[PDB]
Amino acid sequence: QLEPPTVVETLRRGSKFIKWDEETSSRNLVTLRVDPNGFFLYWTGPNMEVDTLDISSIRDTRTGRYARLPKDPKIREVLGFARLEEKLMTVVSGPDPVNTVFLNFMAVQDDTAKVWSEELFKLAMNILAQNASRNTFLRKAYTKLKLQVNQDGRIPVKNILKMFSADKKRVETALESCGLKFNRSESIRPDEFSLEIFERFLNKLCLRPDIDKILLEIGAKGKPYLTLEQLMDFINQKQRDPRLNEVLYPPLRPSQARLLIEKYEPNQQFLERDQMSMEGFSRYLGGEENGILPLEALDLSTDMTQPLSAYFINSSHNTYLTAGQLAGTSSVEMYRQALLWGCRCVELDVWKGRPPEEEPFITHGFTMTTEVPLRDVLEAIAETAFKTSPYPVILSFENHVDSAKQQAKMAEYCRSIFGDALLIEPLDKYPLAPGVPLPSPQDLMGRILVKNKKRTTDEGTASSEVNATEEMSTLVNYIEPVKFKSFEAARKRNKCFEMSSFVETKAMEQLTKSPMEFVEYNKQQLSRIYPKGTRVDSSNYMPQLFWNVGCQLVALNFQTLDVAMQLNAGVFEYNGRSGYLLKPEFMRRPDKSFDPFTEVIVDGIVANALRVKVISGQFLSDRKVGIYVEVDMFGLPVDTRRKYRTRTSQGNSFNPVWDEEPFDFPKVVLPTLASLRIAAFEEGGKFVGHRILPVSAIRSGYHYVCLRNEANQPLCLPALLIYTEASDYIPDSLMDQRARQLAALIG
Ligand SMILES: [Ca+2]
The DSSP code sequence of 127-181 is STTTS--HHHHHHHHHHHHHH---TTSSB-HHHHHHHSTT-SHHHHHHHHHHT--
Contacts (Cβ under 8 Å, ≥6 apart) of 643:
none
Cα separation, 550 vs 119, in Å, equals: 39
Give dist(CA 484, CA 498) in Å, integer.
Answer: 10
Q: How far is CA 499 from CA 76, 203, 247, 419, in A?
A: 51, 59, 44, 26
The reply to whether 364 belongs to the active site is: yes
Phi, psi of 71 (to 5 degrees): -115, 5
**468 C-alpha to ligand 1 centroid (Å):** 18
In sequence order, what are the residues at sequence separation of 6 or more whose Cβ sits closer than 8 angstroms to the Cβ of residue 577? 125, 127, 342, 388, 389
Task: Compute the distance between CA of residue 675 and CA of residue 726 in angstroms, rounded to an integer.
Answer: 13
Kindly tell me the sign of the dihedral angle through the C-alpha atoms of 261, 263, 266, 271. Answer: positive
Which residues is 348 bridged to in the sheet? 397
One of 317, 400, 690, 703 is an active-site residue; which one? 317
Alpha-carbon distance of 173 to 180, in angstroms, equals 10
Check: CB of residue 644 under 8 Å from CB of residue 704.
Answer: no
For residues 538 and 512, is the Cβ–Cβ distance under 8 A? no
336 within 8 A of 389, measured Cβ to Cβ: no
**CA nearest neighbour of 147 among 57, 44, 46:** 44
Question: Residues 641, 743: contact at Cβ < 8 Å?
Answer: no
Give, as residue ranges, everything with CB less than 5 Å from ion ligand 1.
Answer: 349, 398
**From the CA of 739, how far away is ligand 1's center (Å)?**
29
Side chain identity at 589, as an amino acid letter?
R
Q: How close is the Cα of 321 to the center of ligand 1, in Å?
A: 10
Task: Tell me, in angstroms, the distance from the centre of ligand 1 to residue 399's CA.
Answer: 10
- How many angstroms is it from 368 CA to the middle of ligand 1? 15
Q: Which of 701, 703, 706 is nearest to 719 (CA)?
A: 706
Alpha-carbon torsion 739, 740, 742, 747, what sign?
A: positive
Relative orientation angle of helices 374-383 and 333-341, to the nearest 10 degrees? 30
Q: Quote the CA–CA distance of 409 and 391 in Å, as a whole number.
A: 27
Contacts of 301 (CB under 8 A, 6+ apart): 575
Whole-number Å distance, alpha carbon 505 to ligand 1 midpoint, is 16
Distance 357 CA to ligand 1 centre (A): 25
- Which residues are paired to 721 by β-bridges? 616, 704
Chain centroid, CA 40 distance in Å: 20
Q: Give CA separation, 17 vs 45, 107, 112, 119, 215, in Å.
A: 11, 4, 10, 16, 53
Task: Give the whole-angstrom CA distance, residue 102 versus residue 336.
Answer: 14
Q: Tell me how far apart the alpha carbons of residues 695 and 672 are, in angstroms, rounded to a whole number.
A: 7
Tell me the helix, strand and coil percentages in the chain, rounded to 5. Answer: 30, 20, 50
Please state the φ and ψ torsions of residue 53, each to the nearest 5 degrees: -130, 120
CA angle 578–380–343, rounded 5-degree value: 25
Rounded CA-CA distance 652/467 in Å is 63
What order do you get walking across the sheet with 526-530 strand by strand?
Answer: 480-481, 498-503, 526-530, 553-554, 311-313, 580-582
Nearest Cα neighbor of 352 from 333, 370, 373 is 373
* CA neighbor of 714 nearest in space, from 237, 132, 93: 132
Identity of residue 522: N
* Closest listed residue to residue 96, CA positions, set 704, 732, 558, 433: 558
- Rounded distance from Cα 555 to ligand 1 centre (Å): 11
- Supply φ then ψ for residue 54, to 5 degrees: -65, 125
The 3-state DSSP class for residue 258 equals: helix
Amino acid in the structure at residue 67: A
Distance CA 465, CA 350 (A): 11
**Rounded distance between C-alpha atoms, residue 267 and residue 260, angstroms:** 13
Q: Is 203 helix (H, G, I), strand (E, B) or coil?
A: helix
Q: Which residues contact 541 (CB under 8 A, 6 or more apart)?
A: 504, 531, 564, 746
**Rounded Cα distance, 690 and 351, in Å:** 40
**In whole angstroms, what is the distance from residue 470 CA to residue 453 CA?**
11
Give 730-737's long-range contacts (Cβ < 8 A, gap of 24+): 730/609, 731/601, 735/512, 735/513
How many beta carbons lie within 10 A of that of residue 664, not counting itself? 13
Cβ contact 503:527 at 8 Å: no
The kind and range of the H/E element at 492 are helix 488-492
CA gap 689, 301 in Å, rounded: 28
Separation CA 232–CA 253 (nearest Å): 7
Q: How far apart are CA 622 and CA 151, in angstroms?
A: 26
Query: Residue 379's closest CA among 430, 425, 413?
Result: 413
The CATH number of the domain covering residues in 209-285: 1.10.238.10
Q: How far, in whole angstroms, is CA 540 from its chain's centroid?
A: 18
User: Residue 569: exposed, middle, or buried by beta-carbon count in 10 A (0-12, 13-18, 19+)?
Assistant: buried
Give the determination technique.
cryo-EM
Cα–Cα nearest to 577, from 129, 127, 128: 127
Q: Confirm if 540 and 557 have CB atoms less than 8 A apart.
A: yes
Strands (E), 399-483: 448-451, 480-481
SS3 7: coil
Residues paired with 44 in a beta bridge: 50
Residue 471, burial from CB neighbour count under 10 angstroms (0-12, 13-18, 19+): middle
For the chain, how many helices (H) and strands (E)? 21, 27
- Residue 606 neighbours by CB distance under 10 Å: 11
Angle, vertex CA 710, rays to CA 706 and CA 716, nearest 5? 35
Ligand 1 centroid vs 564 CA: distance in angstroms? 19
Q: How distant is the alpha carbon of residue 442 from its chain centre?
A: 23
Rounded to whole angstroms, how far apart are CA atoms 651 and 649? 6
Task: Tell me phi and psi for residue 312, to 5 degrees.
Answer: -65, 125
Please give the distance, rounded to the nearest whole angstrom, from the Cα atom of residue 377 to the centre of ligand 1: 15
Burial class (CB in 10 A: 0-12, 13-18, 19+), 108: exposed
Q: How far apart are CA 137 and CA 269, in angstroms?
A: 29
The rounded distance, in Å, linking the Cα atoms of 401 and 407 is: 7
- 690 assigned to active site: no
Distance CA 704, CA 723 (A): 9
Q: What separation in Å is there between the alpha carbon of 346 and the centre of ligand 1?
A: 10
Contact predicate 277/546, CB 8 Å? no
From the list 364, 400, 690, 703, the catalytic residue is: 364
- CA angle 302/308/309 to nearest 5° reads 110
* Cα–Cα distance measured from residue 607 to residue 728, given in angstroms and rounded to the nearest whole number: 6
AA identity, residue 235? I
Across-strand partners of 720?
A: 617, 705
Deposited resolution, Å: 3.6
Q: CA 271 → CA 5, 221, 228, 268, 278, distances in Å?
A: 31, 20, 11, 5, 13
What contacts 24+ positions apart, CB below 8 Å, involve 638-642? Answer: 638/597, 638/598, 638/599, 638/667, 638/669, 638/741, 639/665, 639/667, 639/668, 639/669, 639/670, 639/674, 640/544, 640/744, 640/745, 641/665, 641/744, 642/677, 642/744, 642/747
Cα–Cα distance measured from residue 282 to residue 269, given in angstroms and rounded to the nearest whole number: 18
Beta bridge partner(s), residue 103:
91
3-state secondary structure of 653: coil
Closest to 676 measured CA to CA, from 700, 661, 701, 695: 695
Q: Identify any residues that bridge with 694 across adjacent strands, giving them in sequence order.
A: 675
**Cα(557) to centroid(ligand 1), Å:** 11
How far, in Å, from the CA of 351 to the mean position of ligand 1? 12
Q: Produce one character per residue of 503-542: b if its CB has 16 or more CB atoms within 10 Å, e if not.
A: bbeebbebbbeebeebbbbbbbbbbbbbbbbeeeebebbb
Nearest CA among 311, 360, 194 for reference residue 578:
311
The answer to whether 178 and 197 are in contact (CB under 8 A) is yes
Q: Cα(375) to centroid of ligand 1, in Å?
A: 18
Contact residues for 417 (Cβ-Cβ < 8 A; gap 6+): 375, 378, 379, 382
Residue type, 274: D
Give dist(CA 364, CA 474) in Å, integer.
26
Q: Whats the size of the chain, residue-wise? A: 747
Per-residue HEC secondary structure of 543-606 comes to: CHHHHCCCCCEECCCCCCCCHHHHHHHHHCCCCCCCCEEECCHHHCCCCCCCCCCCCCCCCCCC
